[PDB]
Design a protein around this ligand. Structure first.
Ligand SMILES: OC[C@H]1O[C@H](O[C@H]2[C@H](O)[C@@H](O)[C@H](OCCCCCCC3CCCCC3)O[C@@H]2CO)[C@H](O)[C@@H](O)[C@@H]1O
Ligand SMILES: *C(=O)/C=C/N[C@@H](C(=O)O)[C@](C)(COC(=O)CCCC(=O)O)S(=O)O
Length: 265
């Protein structure tokens, strides 16, 4: 594999789309690689990690409990609800909803949680409170990943998303238990985690949340590193490419391969 930046460029050439990428030390925030890092990209399902950061902040403040059971109706369900559709009779706890949203990609679970934090506007306000002045959520599942060209709704930048994830996971804005919980949800991803592990060399840590959208939109927010340590935050977004899902996945994996082969920078 070529160098990370060289691979990123090749991916844009091959996909005819824009790639946005940040690689950042988790402990310190040292930026190692930045490409279109201040450009906007649709967050897609990656917003679910920030959503559950807001939930945990409410738990820390005593305004929420992960134990609290929410009962909902079939009319509340949106497209793709593999866990929430199973609990119309008995409900789900707030913590179960975060687990379902982040680890199983459950969309109704995300919407239920979004309501508890005051909707897209409430989540955006939370982002402003932690000093993210760029990321914005405007819509609910499933409209939020429409990825219209030039539409600023439901977008982040690689730099903003990396910084925000670092804040939630490490900055002590969340309690120790809450930081640990958010991390464990990412470790437990079942949508892409097991697949990614299957292709990572021995010794590489992965935790992640992935997303997909229209017009080629695809993305991942990840913790990655050798010696089984979450050494770096890696955020990669793609937009405005007509390529197959397989090829978009392969190109992102190829950027990962370049990072792995050329880690010591
Ligand atoms: O010399 C470094 C390594 O080179 C290869 O490893 C390959 C591996 O066989 C391949 O499957 C992977 O694909 C990349 C898979 C990435 C999966 C997604 C990555 C995520 C992670 C965080 C955000 C970016 C995307 O690349 C590495 C590096 O070439 C060798 O197989 C391995 O023995 C060796 O230790
Ligand atoms: C998040 O990125 C979800 C995007 N795609 C879904 C959507 O538009 O709501 C689909 C319904 C596909 O479903 C999934 O990707 C399942 C996992 C969702 C997640 O990662 O949280 S649409 O057909 O693309």
């Amino acid at each position: 594999s070529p160098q990370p930046l060289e691979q990123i460029k090749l991916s844009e050439s091959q996909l005819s789309g824009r790639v946005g990428m940040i690689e950042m030390d988790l402990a310190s925030g040292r930026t190692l690689t930045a490409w279109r890092a201040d450009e906007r990209f649709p967050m897609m399902s990656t917003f679910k990690v920030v959503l559950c950061g807001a939930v945990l902040a409410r738990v820390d403040a005593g305004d929420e409990q992960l134990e609290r059971k929410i009962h909902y109706r079939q009319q509340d369900l949106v497209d793709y609800s593999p866990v929430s559709e199973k609990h119309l009779a008995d409900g789900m706890t707030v913590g179960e909803l975060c687990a379902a949203a982040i680890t199983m990609g459950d969309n109704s679970a995300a919407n239920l949680l979004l309501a508890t934090v005051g909707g897209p506007a409430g989540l955006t306000a939370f982002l402003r409170q932690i000093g993210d002045n760029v990321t914005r959520l405007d819509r609910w599942e499933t409209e939020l990943n429409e990825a219209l060209p030039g539409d600023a709704r439901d977008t982040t930048t690689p730099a903003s998303m990396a910084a925000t994830l670092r804040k939630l996971l490490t900055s002590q804005r969340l309690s120790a238990r809450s930081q640990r919980q958010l991390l464990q949800w990412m470790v437990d991803d079942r949508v892409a985690g097991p697949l990614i592990r299957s292709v990572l060399p021995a010794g590489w840590f992965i935790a992640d949340k992935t997303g997909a959208g229209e017009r080629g939109a695809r993305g991942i927010v990840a913790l990655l590193g050798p010696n089984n340590k979450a050494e770096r935050i890696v955020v990669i977004y793609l937009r405005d490419t007509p390529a197959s899902m397989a090829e978009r996945n392969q190109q992102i994996a190829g950027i990962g391969a370049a990072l792995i082969e050329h880690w010591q920078r």
